[PDB]
């Protein structure tokens, strides 16, 4: 299990940046953002080869323990064995996820959080740097 951070106090409009190494044999990794492990405004899960999925980003929310409706993106700007940076902001409507290779997408903000206080990383991504603008 990877880096867990709490008390982040990330306010709307502020940018969370995470840079890490994707393993040469990576199958998937996860970056969870929210209030705590049961309350995630973003579960961000690039799947290189996991759960039957190939090169697909899976996103979801979790509210009071309950997973929301999953959504898949259609661009996969990650490569095993390379460094990748992810930048996330939010407002009350949406989280904006900025990825490598110019790609950006929005994910609806389905929870009611004043700030993002919790990050957790897991899977085949070694975190090298985290910046809170």
Ligand X SMILES: CCCO[C@@H]1O[C@H](CO)[C@@H](O[C@@H]2O[C@H](CO)[C@H](O)[C@H](OCc3cn(Cc4cccc(C#CCN)c4)nn3)[C@H]2O)[C@H](O)[C@H]1NC(C)=O
For a copy of itself, the binding residues (CB under 8 A) are: 1-8, 127-133
CB of 100 to ligand X, least distance (A): 19
CB of 38 to ligand X, least distance (A): 13
Select from 18, 22, 29, 84 the one that contacts ligand X (CB under 6 A).
29
Q: Rule CB under 6 A: say whether 78 interacts with ligand X.
A: no
CB 131 within 8 A of CB 45: no
What is the CB-side half-sphere exposure of residue 46 using CA atoms within 13 A? Answer: 25
Q: Please choose which of a copy of itself, ligand X, none residue 51 contacts, taking the beta carbon within 5 to 8 angstroms, the exact cut-off set by kind.
A: ligand X
The residue (of 53 and 122) whose beta carbon lies closer to a copy of itself is 122
CB 59 within 8 A of CB 107: yes
CB 73 within 8 A of CB 82: no
What sign for the dihedral angle of Cα 11, 15, 3, 112?
Answer: positive
Q: Rule CB under 6 A: say whether 35 interacts with ligand X.
A: no
The residue (of 50 and 115) whose beta carbon lies closer to ligand X is 50
Q: Rule CB under 6 A: say whether 36 interacts with ligand X.
A: no
Distance CA 56, CA 43 (A): 14
- Is 109 marked as a binding-site residue? no
CA angle 132, 11, 38 (to 5 degrees): 90
The residue (of 30 and 75) whose beta carbon lies closer to ligand X is 30
CB 126 within 8 A of CB 44: no
Q: Per the annotation, where are the binding residues for a beta-D-galactoside? A: 43-47, 51, 60, 67-70
């Amino acid at each position: 299990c990877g880096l867990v951070a709490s008390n982040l106090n990330l306010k709307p409009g502020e940018c969370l940046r995470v840079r890490g190494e994707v393993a040469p044999d990576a199958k998937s990794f996860v970056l969870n953002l929210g209030k705590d492990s049961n309350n995630l405004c973003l579960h961000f899960n690039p799947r290189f080869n996991a759960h039957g999925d190939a090169n697909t980003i899976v996103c979801n929310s979790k509210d009071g323990g309950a997973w929301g409706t999953e959504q898949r993106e259609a661009v996969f700007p990650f490569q095993p064995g390379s460094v990748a940076e992810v930048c996330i902001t939010f407002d009350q409507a949406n989280l904006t996820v900025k990825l490598p290779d110019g790609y950006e997408f929005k994910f609806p903000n389905r929870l009611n959080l004043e700030a993002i206080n919790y990050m957790a990383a897991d899977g085949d991504f070694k975190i090298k740097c985290v910046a809170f603008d």
